[PDB]
Amino acid sequence: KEWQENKSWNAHFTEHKSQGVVVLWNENKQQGFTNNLKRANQAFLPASTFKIPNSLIALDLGVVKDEHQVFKWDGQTRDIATWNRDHNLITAMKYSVVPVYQEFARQIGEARMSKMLHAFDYGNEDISGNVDSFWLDGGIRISATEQIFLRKLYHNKLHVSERSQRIVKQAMLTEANGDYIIRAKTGYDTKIGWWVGWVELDDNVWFFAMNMDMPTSDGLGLRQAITKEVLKQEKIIP
Amino acid sequence: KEWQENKSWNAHFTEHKSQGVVVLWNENKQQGFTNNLKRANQAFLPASTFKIPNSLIALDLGVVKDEHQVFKWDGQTRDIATWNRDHNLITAMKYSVVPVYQEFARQIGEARMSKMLHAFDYGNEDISGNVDSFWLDGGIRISATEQISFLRKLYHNKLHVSERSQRIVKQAMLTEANGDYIIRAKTGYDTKIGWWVGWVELDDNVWFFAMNMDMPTSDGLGLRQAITKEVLKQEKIIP
Ligand SMILES: [Cl-]
Ligand SMILES: [Cl-]
Ligand SMILES: [Cl-]
Ligand SMILES: [Cl-]
Numbered sequence: 001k002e003w004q005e006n007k008s009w010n011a012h013f014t015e016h017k018s019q020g021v022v023v024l025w026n027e028n029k030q031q032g033f034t035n036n037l038k039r040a041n042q043a044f045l046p047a048s049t050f051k052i053p054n055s056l057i058a059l060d061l062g063v064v065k066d067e068h069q070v071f072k073w074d075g076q077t078r079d080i081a082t083w084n085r086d087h088n089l090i091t092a093m094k095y096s097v098v099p100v101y102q103e104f105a106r107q108i109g110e111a112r113m114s115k116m117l118h119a120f121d122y123g124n125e126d127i128s129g130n131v132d133s134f135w136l137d138g139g140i141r142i143s144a145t146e147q148i149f150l151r152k153l154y155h156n157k158l159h160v161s162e163r164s165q166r167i168v169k170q171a172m173l174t175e176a177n178g179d180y181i182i183r184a185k186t187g188y189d190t191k192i193g194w195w196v197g198w199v200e201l202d203d204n205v206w207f208f209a210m211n212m213d214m215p216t217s218d219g220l221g222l223r224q225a226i227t228k229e230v231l232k233q234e235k236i237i238p
Numbered sequence: 239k240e241w242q243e244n245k246s247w248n249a250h251f252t253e254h255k256s257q258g259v260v261v262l263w264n265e266n267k268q269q270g271f272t273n274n275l276k277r278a279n280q281a282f283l284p285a286s287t288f289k290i291p292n293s294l295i296a297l298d299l300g301v302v303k304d305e306h307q308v309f310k311w312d313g314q315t316r317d318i319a320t321w322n323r324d325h326n327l328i329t330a331m332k333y334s335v336v337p338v339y340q341e342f343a344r345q346i347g348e349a350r351m352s353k354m355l356h357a358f359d360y361g362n363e364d365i366s367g368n369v370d371s372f373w374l375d376g377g378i379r380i381s382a383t384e385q386i387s388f389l390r391k392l393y394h395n396k397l398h399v400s401e402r403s404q405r406i407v408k409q410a411m412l413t414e415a416n417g418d419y420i421i422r423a424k425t426g427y428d429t430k431i432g433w434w435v436g437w438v439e440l441d442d443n444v445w446f447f448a449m450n451m452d453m454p455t456s457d458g459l460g461l462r463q464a465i466t467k468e469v470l471k472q473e474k475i476i477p
């Protein structure tokens with residue numbers, strides 16, 4: 001009753017010769033839905049969805065002063081054109097600028113990063129590996145249901161200031177029109193791709209967390225596209 | 239120069255057989271642009287654009303606890319269907335739900351309202367009339383450039399209210415967002431004129447805008463956004 005399985009959504013993954021899970025949470029009804037109950041609770045690397053807690057920690061420790069502070073390009077020409085420029089928290093989130101967040105993580109340091117993830121109840125709370133890459137290739141793991149962390153963020157219940165939480169929710173802003181607002185973050189670890197966040201409507205909020213097998217970055221647009229198809233199927237968005 | 243007049247934009251108004259002003263402010267360059275410097279400084283009733291300062295004050299005084307608090311419909315059936323229901327701050331600003339803001343204003347009260355508009359440097363700072371209708375039929379007046387000035391303070395958290403209040407109101411002003419830009423803004427209509435004021439966030443800049451236009455009928459209200467967007471598009475601010 002609290003959780004309900006809907007395998008019809010599998011078609012949206014197999015339509016694209018893929019495999020994955022979408023988890024939805026209806027906040028007003030306190031009811032969850034997914035196409036795959038097992039996979040909804042399997043833990044994966046968070047990859048760049050880790051930018052959500054990393055941002056909160058950087059803000060609350062004063063590593064980042066506000067969303068306007070500029071992190072200047074380090075002058076290394078990288079493969080992603082939008083990384084080769086100055087950023088602030090907003091644009092760094094938007095373009096998933098790993099080198100900016102690696103600098104945050106080094107400033108934060110291991111002892112504080114670990115304490116804060118413990119305080120967040122975030123995934124397996126394990127930062128084994130490099131302090132500035134463990135969310136990409138170290139020991140940290142989180143499941144889709146565990147990402148649905150987001151409910152605490154939404155309600156300002158995380159163990160960081162309300163201000164830090166409002167700034168990160170602002171930075172997560174992805175889309176808005178007269179029908180809905182999406183606040184979310186993508187991630188990709190070269191094997192699975194993520195999209196996690198929520199959809200704000202006039203009278204409700206739907207939290208989502210999706211991950212999918214993702215051999216190639218050619219199909220990264222499928223993270224949003226598959227998720228939106230489910231949302232349209234469920235009459236959450238038009 | 240700091241201000242430049244671009245009368246080519248008059249084309250966007252006349253092509254819809256109306257008259258009005260658009261003011262733009264390029265924050266990076268600290269430069270302003272308008273089709274009409276005189277109308278840019280003409281002070282009008284703010285109408286529902288007053289919901290921005292009203293929200294700020296209601297939040298800072300704790301009249302509104304946060305953006306999720308529900309304000310129950312009072313049960314009076316009004317002419318606007320979306321008004322005949324429960325609202326929170328977000329939906330009340332979205333649907334310009336006058337009666338909800340009238341209740342805010344009555345609880346703020348005239349002394350605190352007057353004091354905070356002075357602290358805000360808002361328009362002519364005049365709240366004469368009823369405390370719960372003066373922005374619709376009373377003495378307060380604000381010009382397009384004054385709107386820009388006020389919005390720049392809000393953007394930068396420089397208004398004399400808490401940073402929290404300012405962040406919540408900027409959230410409530412969210413109108414549109416895609417991969418290219420974010421618009422935070424508020425419409426207004428006082429039966430004779432229509433407004434649209436706010437700003438456009440880009441990756442590397444912010445453009446503030448304030449527009450108003452003659453509005454003899456409610457049929458043309460969509461022209462407030464349409465005209466403003468045509469100008470933004472002309473200036474390659476948005477695609
Ligand atoms: Cl926002
Ligand atoms: Cl990504
Ligand atoms: Cl420029
Ligand atoms: Cl609005």
Ligand SMILES: [Mg+2]
Pocket residue numbers: 073074076077078083084085099
């Ligand atoms: Mg680079």
Ligand SMILES: [Mg+2]
Pocket residue numbers: 127128129130
């Ligand atoms: Mg280790």
Ligand SMILES: [Mg+2]
Pocket residue numbers: 202203308324325326329
């Ligand atoms: Mg409501």
